């Protein structure tokens, strides 16, 4: 139709205008600004603890706010709450559906979430006074599988779906507060800002969107990737975020600049990133890979400053303690090591 | 205060026993993924006192690209086939050549065996229209034609079988094999065929662990 063609041309014109504005914004580049900083050197980290007890492949992992307890999700239908310091399992939650692709630890330490191909986000009450751990709520409004779920507060949760939609739930009533539509492919990862007002969402359309939780509406769309975005992670100050993809690149975007700054890629890496995380100071950018390794990039100068090795299969989850003392990597070999 | 430290060890040793108990249940059961050309369906059946666990992801989207990686430890993938044939062939290409499914075997199930008998007889939609090579395909004579069907149907079925086997035994270089089969709308012995194929799959996997085959 004439209206559709005219509207598509109008959209193309605004895309060109946005591209021109971003190009005029990029007076300099981060590579040529950070040449007068001493390199971090060589970072050697060793497996302090190896945590065994999973039968199937570990598909998700989340640290606690106290940097002591971390939860793990496995395809055999288990949620194990470990104690990193003593290598002692504290809980073993059996899941209704064995296919779980996500797990979230509440900041208060009272609830843990899980979800997968069952299309359902289930919250587990760990405190469970006068009883054992049981399902507290069964959030079911998603047509597609859950890829990532994160806790804003102890009462409300944000989840991603394979039906091209992010959701903000109210656990007390078990209902959708806002729906985050606007993507075109499967949403695969979320990252909440240090202030729980904004969150980014990677997807399979090679685009990362900036969402406002209260307003329920996009603010920026970041497109600099060639393939699906698998991992996403905010900078500690909340003014930037790294983005891993399946094209062997993990770029860094800015919110104020509204464009990419630095691409972290090497010619010897032909695999895909499955996990992206930042150090406490933001200088080190840890990244997972399908080559059974984990590289320690330097966020300011895009050079490799360390390799973490020791996984038989691909790393599928990576996390850094809020204390910033240790980094945990989980792989498909049913193992979960802690590096420090 | 060592009381907390000993209580933690006691809880650890209590849930480790439960994990050991659940390990046997996890290992003694065999998972299968059933797909063709509330949100997930689970079917449990046992034949000859061995437990199976069949799955049917029919409440999701058509982008079977991110959640197909979850089914890599599954012992076998049941591929049911009813231009839907070309779509099935490309789907089998993608499943076979996926770098995470290189060690997962596929058990084909070519249905509509009785439906094609009338379709070829009518001639309204000739198979040669979609597959020009069918005009020069001859049965390899190592077949088992059921008395009652013309050679046209027993050639057509083996044509699709040969297409799937051409996909299968050509690339991949992985620890996996394909098991073609023919079914109908009245038989109930397909569970036995799945049981035998799974027996073969774990047999070959064990033999390759011993590095005999």
């Amino acid at each position, epitope marked *: 139709q004439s209206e559709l063609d005219q509207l598509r041309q109008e959209a193309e014109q605004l895309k060109n205008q946005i591209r021109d504005a971003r190009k005029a914004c990029a007076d300099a580049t981060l590579s040529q600004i950070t040449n007068n900083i001493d390199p971090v050197g060589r970072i050697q980290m060793r497996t302090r603890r190896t945590l065994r007890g999973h039968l199937a492949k570990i598909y998700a992992m989340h640290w606690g706010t106290d940097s002591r307890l971390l939860v793990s999700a496995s395809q055999d239908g288990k949620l194990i709450i470990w104690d990193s310091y003593t290598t002692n399992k504290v809980h073993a939650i059996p899941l209704r559906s064995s296919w779980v692709m996500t797990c979230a630890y509440a900041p208060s330490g009272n609830y843990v979430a899980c979800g997968g191909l069952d299309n359902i986000c289930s919250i587990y009450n760990l405190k469970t006074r006068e009883g054992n751990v049981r399902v507290s709520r069964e959030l079911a409004g998603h047509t597609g599988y859950l890829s990532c779920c994160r806790f804003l507060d102890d009462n409300q949760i944000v989840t991603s779906s394979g039906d091209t939609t992010c959701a903000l739930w109210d656990i007390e009533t078990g209902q959708q507060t806002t729906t985050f539509t606007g993507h075109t492919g499967d949403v695969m990862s979320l990252s909440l800002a240090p202030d729980t007002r904004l969150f980014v969402s990677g997807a399979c359309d090679a685009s990362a969107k900036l969402w406002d939780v209260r307003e329920g509406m996009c603010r920026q769309t970041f497109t600099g990737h060639e*393939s699906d975005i698998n991992a996403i992670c905010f900078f500690p100050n909340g003014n930037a975020f790294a983005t891993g993809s399946d094209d062997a690149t993990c770029r860094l975007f800015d919110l104020r600049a509204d464009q990419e700054l630095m691409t972290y890629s090497h010619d010897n890496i032909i695999c895909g990133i499955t996990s992206v995380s930042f150090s406490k100071s933001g200088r080190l950018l840890l990244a997972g890979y399908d080559d059974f390794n984990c590289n320690v990039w330097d966020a300011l100068k895009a050079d490799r400053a360390g390799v973490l090795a020791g996984h038989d299969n691909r790393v599928s989850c990576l996390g850094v303690t809020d204390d910033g003392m240790a980094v945990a990597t989980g792989s498909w070999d049913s193992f979960l090591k802690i590096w420090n | 205060q060592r009381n907390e430290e000993k209580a933690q060890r006691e809880a650890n040793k209590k849930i480790e026993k439960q994990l050991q108990k659940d390990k046997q249940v996890y290992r003694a059961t065999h998972r299968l993924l059933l797909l063709g050309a509330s949100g997930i369906f689970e079917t449990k059946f046992q034949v000859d006192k061995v437990n199976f666990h069949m799955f049917d992801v029919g409440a999701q989207r058509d982008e079977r690209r991110k959640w197909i990686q979850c089914f890599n430890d599954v012992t076998a993938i049941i591929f049911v086939v009813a231009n839907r044939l070309q779509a099935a062939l490309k789907l089998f290409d993608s499943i076979w050549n996926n770098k995470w499914l290189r060690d997962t075997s596929v058990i084909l199930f070519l249905n509509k065996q009785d439906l094609l008998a009338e379709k070829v007889l009518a001639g309204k939609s000739k198979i040669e229209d979609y597959f020009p090579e069918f005009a020069r395909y001859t049965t390899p004579e190592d077949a088992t034609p059921e008395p009652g069907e013309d050679p046209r149907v027993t050639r057509a079925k083996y044509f699709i079988r040969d297409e799937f086997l051409r996909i299968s035994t050509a690339s991949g270089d992985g620890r996996h094999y394909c098991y073609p089969h023919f079914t109908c709308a009245v038989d109930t012995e397909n569970i036995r065929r799945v049981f035998n194929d799974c027996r073969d799959i774990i047999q070959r996997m064990h033999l390759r662990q011993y590095e005999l085959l």
Partner: nanobody
Amino acid sequence: VQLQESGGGLVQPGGSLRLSCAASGFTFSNYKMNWVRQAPGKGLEWVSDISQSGASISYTGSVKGRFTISRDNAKNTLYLQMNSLKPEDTAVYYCARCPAPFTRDCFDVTSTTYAYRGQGTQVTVS
């Protein structure tokens, strides 16, 4: 990732037509490409494909011997040449790209949901 297609139009039966796709955003030499089509009142059908270096090419039988595919890595463009068209070969032709680099598998015929696909061009035979 942008894939702009052109070269379509109304063609008399038994004629010829050459569709071209302009690719911008990705390293064209690392991704296996595809050509898909959608006949009116039907679903998306796979027509052809090509490998990273153009070594491996496959067709969908009904187009075998009449259609040929070719890719130019330097110019980041991909062509599909159509010879002896028939009225049955009328559809909107899309130029889908396989999801990931250095991969032999391609899940790129999704029901109007694939992100890495072009807007498509109309090719009519009458």
